């Protein structure tokens, strides 16, 4: 016929995501108004739970939601090759969207597009300029030695230097910082070779990154309470003024600028991960990695509703509102930058544009079992439960096991 009901899986569940959810609901309402009979049932799920358990299990059963928050790289590759992702090339051409995205490479398998980035990301250090000034730092550190000097000065003032919430199942929050440490010590191509068999987690330059990560914790630069706080609590420690910096993705800018929760809005700056002097200088972790994918097991009315949702979500107006009102870097070209953008906003753009290149997050490049093994391992590493050497050996074992199976 007919009238259809589609499940829309999203991860915009936290109070710091109210903006993003409201924009999604606004898009949904517009789609329902122009497609009679089409109804969307929003299913909000925690980020780790959707990506690593719920959607993973649904896809193993071959029964994903019709619409779901999806990650580029390994996740998209697995579900595309299992045949559970709608190919989007023809929809994009029909909607005149074929040429409008900055980068679809993470969502592309054998030339076919299997999901659409909602936004871009970078990762970097948010920092409190007043807490820095209290400790004698007057500039954001550009180099690693400038960075450790800042950490020393902060610790000497009994200021918690680096907030980080890596407890419970939020090991990925530690991996954001690890992520960029081992690209800085080993270079961006090192993480590309793990899945290829051409580099190893045990390579000395990679191990060096994890040595430095542990040392940040041992010296008290990473919050001693890192394993006692969930991701969002680590975030809150920074934006309530209780620690001097925070390594996080640009989706976090909203939380940090939130009027009701942030005490630091007049005193926040940003700097890229500092230069160590190897193959990763002046690079930035970033890309277009996260957005919506669609089930391939659709009847014609489902396909019509899915096309209309894509039409109404991936539009310059919706992208510009996410940028101006939720600080989410556009995934589409041609989005004008809003008026009176906060200093923080100006700093993150300068950080992105002046980078010589971006490198993706490692979880775009390695299988899910490898990712979750690292998550568990860095929590151990920061808890006195694992040495840097034992971590890299553990990682290369699961890497070999993943490469052999695939
Ligand atoms: C469009 C957007 O900004 N989505 C955000 C997600 O990217 C982000 O998830 C994290 O993204 C990183 C970069 O792709 C991944 O390395 C990281 O593994 C991933 N974290 C998880 C738990 O999946 C989430 C974080 O809550 O926020 C989204 O809004």
Numbering used by the authors: 46 to 451
Study authors write:
In conclusion, we identified and characterized Paenibacillus spp. NagB1 and NagB2 proteins as SBPs for chitin oligosaccharides. Binding experiments of the recombinant NagB1 and NagB2 to several oligosaccharides using differential scanning fluorimetry and surface plasmon resonance confirmed that both proteins are SBPs of (GlcNAc)2 and (GlcNAc)3. SBPs, a component of ABC transporters, are responsible for trapping ligands that are imported through a specific pathway formed by two TMDs, and mainly define the specificity and affinity of transporters. The structures of NagB1 and NagB2 were classified as subcluster D-I and contained two α/β domains connected by a hinge region consisting of three strands, with the substrate-binding pocket located between the two domains.
The crystal structures of NagB2 in ligand-free or complex forms with (GlcNAc)2 (NagB2/(GlcNAc)2) and (GlcNAc)3 (NagB2/(GlcNAc)3) were determined at 1.2 to 1.8 Å resolution. There were two polypeptide chains in the asymmetric unit of the crystal of the ligand-free form (chain A, Asp47–Leu452 and chain B, Val49–Gly450), whereas there was only one polypeptide chain in the ligand-bound form. As indicated by the a.a. sequence similarity, the overall structure of NagB2 was very similar to that of NagB1, with an r.m.s.d. of 1.0 Å for the 394 Cα atoms between the (GlcNAc)2 bound forms. In the crystal structures, the bound oligosaccharides were confined at the binding sites in an extended conformation and were well defined in the density maps. In both (GlcNAc)2 bound structures of NagB1 and NagB2, the first GlcNAc interacted with the tryptophan residue Trp213 of NagB1 or Trp217 of NagB2 and formed hydrogen-bonding networks with surrounding residues. The O3, O4, O6, and O7 atoms of the first GlcNAc formed hydrogen bonds with Arg95, Asp401, and Ser330 of NagB1 and Arg96, Asp408, and Ser334 of NagB2. In NagB2/(GlcNAc)2, Lys416 interacted with the first GlcNAc via a water molecule. The second GlcNAc unit formed a CH/π interaction with Trp292 of NagB1 or Trp296 of NagB2. In NagB2, this residue was substituted with Thr65, but the spatially closer Arg373 played an important role in recognizing the second GlcNAc. When (GlcNAc)2 was bound, this angle changed to 56.8° between the closed and open forms and 30.2° between the closed and semi-closed forms.
